[PDB]
Design a protein around this ligand. Structure first.
Ligand SMILES: *[C@@H]1O[C@H](CO)[C@@H](O)[C@H](O)[C@H]1NC(C)=O
Length: 207
């Protein structure tokens, strides 16, 4: 039978195939709700490193965005009544951002602005947690964190995501990727810093 809730997790760059740091929030939802299953998005999660196949960041985001859209759409078709939750970390947050909000990603070669998710899939997605999203920019209504600048693939100032009310994007000032910081460690600690807050949001979003 189909699960009551299903969580999609996308990892950060250079991490081997799996959930990566998205695991923290994914596990919190699974443990807190009976009938919750999950799956990790299968994509390169690379930035030119030989460790992850040598696939460039742009090609990783291009593949990832499509992989994310295909996984969510396909699962919804199999289980249309299941509540969906997305958890992306770093590059993982970027592919979910592109797939859910659309608006294109020019810095990575994506010009299409249409949301790749089906109407049914979009309505099934109840909550989305982004941590260290390189598409971050200060001012977005779903932002949480001390960052007051932007990431390397910053969204337009005043960007309007159709599903803005279903998202929580965490990003602090010292993050060098989702912000203009210089401390890489801050980028890796969102699961511990905002994990419980994320869960609380997901709980309020779920029916
Ligand atoms: C995306 O990358 C994965 C491996 O990470 C691969 O299995 C898949 O075939 C790629 N998808 C496309 C559309 O190229």
């Amino acid at each position: 039978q189909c699960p009551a809730i299903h969580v999609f997790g996308a990892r950060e760059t250079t991490v081997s195939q799996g959930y990566g740091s998205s695991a923290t929030v994914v596990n919190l939802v699974i443990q807190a709700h009976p009938g919750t299953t999950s799956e990790a998005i299968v994509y390169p999660a690379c930035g030119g490193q030989a460790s992850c196949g040598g696939i460039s960041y742009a090609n990783s985001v291009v593949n990832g965005t499509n992989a994310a859209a295909a996984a969510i759409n396909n699962f919804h078709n199999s289980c249309p009544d299941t509540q969906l939750v997305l958890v992306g970390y770093s590059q993982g947050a970027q592919i979910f951002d592109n797939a859910l909000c659309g608006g294109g990603d020019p810095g990575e070669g994506i010009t299409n602005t249409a949301v790749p998710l089906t109407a049914g899939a979009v309505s099934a997605v109840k909550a989305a947690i982004f941590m260290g999203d390189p598409r971050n920019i200060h001012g977005l209504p779903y932002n949480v964190g001390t960052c007051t600048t932007q990431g390397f693939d910053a969204r337009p100032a005043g960007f309007v995501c159709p599903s803005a009310s279903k998202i929580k994007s965490y990003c602090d000032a010292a993050d060098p990727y989702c912000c203009t910081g210089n401390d890489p460690n801050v980028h890796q600690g969102y699961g511990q810093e905002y994990g419980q807050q994320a869960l609380a949001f997901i709980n309020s979003q779920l029916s």
